[PDB]
Amino acid sequence: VTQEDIIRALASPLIKDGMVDEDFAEKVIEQESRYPTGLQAKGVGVAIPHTLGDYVRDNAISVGILDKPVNFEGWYQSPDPVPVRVVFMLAIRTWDDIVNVLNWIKDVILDEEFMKRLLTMSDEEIYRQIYTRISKAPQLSGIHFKREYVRHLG
Amino acid sequence: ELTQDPAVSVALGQTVRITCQGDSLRSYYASWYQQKPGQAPVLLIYGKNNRPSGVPDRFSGSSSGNTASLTITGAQAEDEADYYCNSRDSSGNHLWVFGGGTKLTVLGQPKAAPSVTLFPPSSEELQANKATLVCLISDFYPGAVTVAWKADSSPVKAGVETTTPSKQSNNKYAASSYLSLTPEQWKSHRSYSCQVTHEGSTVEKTVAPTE
Amino acid sequence: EVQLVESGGGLVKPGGSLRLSCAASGFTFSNAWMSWVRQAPGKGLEWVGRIKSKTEGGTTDYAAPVKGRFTISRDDSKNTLYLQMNSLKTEDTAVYYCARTGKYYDFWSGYPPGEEYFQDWGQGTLVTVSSASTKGPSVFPLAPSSKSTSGGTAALGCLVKDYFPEPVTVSWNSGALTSGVHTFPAVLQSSGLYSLSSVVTVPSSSLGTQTYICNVNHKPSNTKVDKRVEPKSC
């Protein structure tokens, strides 16, 4: 189960709600190969794939938990890829908004115990935990987050 | 809100640190610009320590507390310039606030005594009932001169306008000084002198209405 | 190559209005954030304002002393940025630069929404706000004599007195004389008028036989002056 499989699967429900252009997955794939988004958290790799806001109609996040790690190239330069198990796909129109979501995502990936639960919880439980967190961030109020925006892959 | 020393010197080939200080640097990065006289500013460093392509790796950026620093290793004469930091004030009168600028001078270039030429008023300016003495000072380094004027043997401490020295090509400096007087003043004195002091030694040129 | 060409600067009375334009090329203008930065003569850089890309929301921010007097706008179909300046004041006198503005945010350390930086600058357009009126220059020869000359070479020049506003350019023999030419920075006299000088070093033995003309150009007053500089009988 490859990088393209992951991106296509996380883009699918955004495409279905028309949140994004219908070729959004291919645009994220091409942007990931130019500007990689693999990040090293403490015990686990994270990726935050996205593309330009011109391709998004309305703001949303799509979350993926990988049963086994998948290599993503590093956000930061590194000879070795980042083995990722947690993926936040972003569909954000504006620069100002995306910088706020990334700050927020940093806070959750440094939450070691929340990340610990991300690896074990159900789709439903993951939904409720992220939804609560998002709703306590007034700057995140424009971001749409639905139960079908969470899934496991593999 | 962004403080920067007005002037700093560095020996040729050594390292200089140009630091900028303000509250907003605690939370945001500084961008750094080089500006030479007569030209547009040029971006040197942005973000943490990113260089635009074409900026030499002698330039770097760093940050510590409420300060940010532009470091230039092995300074070259071509690095002489005004350096400006910029950052986010976000509550002040300028969302993007510049420091006041630091002029970098590179010491250790070859010393050169000024070449001085003084022109009297032309016949055409006199016929137009005006008169200017023109003192042109060229090819000196370091780029600091003191200019004084004399009427006859007496100094003239008003009516004088001197440009701050500016780099030529060839890395020497040039400056000008103008003495405005009336045609009768010119015709009335025995002579006027321009007196240029550079590194404690003085070159005086004299003109007289007689010639 | 990136190219930013400002235009529209000139002399204008206090309370007047002026519009600046900047034509961009060499990059995708409609993706770009674009700023205006100004520099009063002899002074530091001052940010004026910035307009975001349309996808970013197209919003403007302005410096406080300018808010409610200046407006920034953009025509992406014509790759042009504008600065509308109303209710102008003498303290608005400055060279106005248009700057392509990049944006940066560091994931692990950055603070939203990150930083803006001025990655490409045009050459600037000079805006002079004053109640004084245009004045062309008076050009006078700085004639060589035995009180110039340094043996094999001699300095001769031109004095460009009492003009307003800046700039003045100077060439010699219609630009056919370039080596040894030095043109000095202008001086702002307490009258409010500018003066500058331009000197050229030439062979001493040519002074009786080679003609030397300084070509002075003062575009603010549509004035050109060609002044022949002749050797004195000294």
Author numbering:
A (entry chain C): 2 to 155
B (entry chain L): 2 to 212
C (entry chain H): 1 to 234
From the manuscript:
The high neutralization breadth of the HIV bnAb 10E8 makes elicitation of 10E8-class bnAbs desirable; however, the recessed epitope within gp41 makes envelope trimers poor priming immunogens and requires that 10E8-class bnAbs possess a long heavy chain complementarity determining region 3 (HCDR3) with a specific binding motif. We developed germline-targeting epitope scaffolds with affinity for 10E8-class precursors and engineered nanoparticles for multivalent display. Because the MPER region is sterically occluded at the base of full-length membrane-bound Env and absent from most soluble native-like trimers, epitope scaffold immunogens were previously designed to conformationally stabilize and expose the C-terminal MPER helix. To assess the structural mimicry of the MPER helix within the epitope scaffold and the interaction of the epitope scaffold with the 10E8-class D gene YxFW motif, we determined three crystal structures and one cryoelectron microscopy (cryo-EM) structure of 10E8-GT epitope scaffolds complexed with 10E8-class human antibodies.
Optimization of affinity for mature 10E8 generated 10E8-GT11 that had high affinity (Kd = 1.4 nM) for mature 10E8 but low affinity (geomean Kd = 12 µM) for a minority (6%) of NGS precursors. In all four complexes, the overall structures of the epitope scaffold and the MPER helix were similar to the original T117v2 scaffold complexed with 10E8, with backbone root mean square deviation (bb-r.m.s.d.) values of 0.73, 0.89, 0.75 and 0.62 Å for the 10E8-GT antigens, respectively. In all except complex 3, the antibody engaged the epitope scaffold at an angle closely resembling the interaction between mature 10E8 and the MPER peptide, and the D gene YxFW motif interacted with the engineered D gene binding pocket and adopted a conformation similar to that of mature 10E8 bound to MPER peptide, with all-atom r.m.s.d. values computed over YxFW of 0.5, 0.47 and 0.32 Å for complexes 1, 2 and 4, respectively. In complex 3, the FW portion of the YxFW motif also accurately mimicked the interaction between mature 10E8 and MPER peptide (all-atom r.m.s.d. = 1.04 Å over FW), but the Yx portion of the motif was divergent, owing to the antibody approaching the MPER from an angle differing from mature 10E8 by ~46°, potentially due to a different conformation of the immature HCDR3. In conclusion, despite variability in the angle of binding of diverse precursors, the 10E8 scaffolds stabilized the MPER in the 10E8-bound conformation and consistently engaged the hydrophobic tip of 10E8-class HCDR3s in a manner closely resembling the interaction of mature 10E8 with gp41.
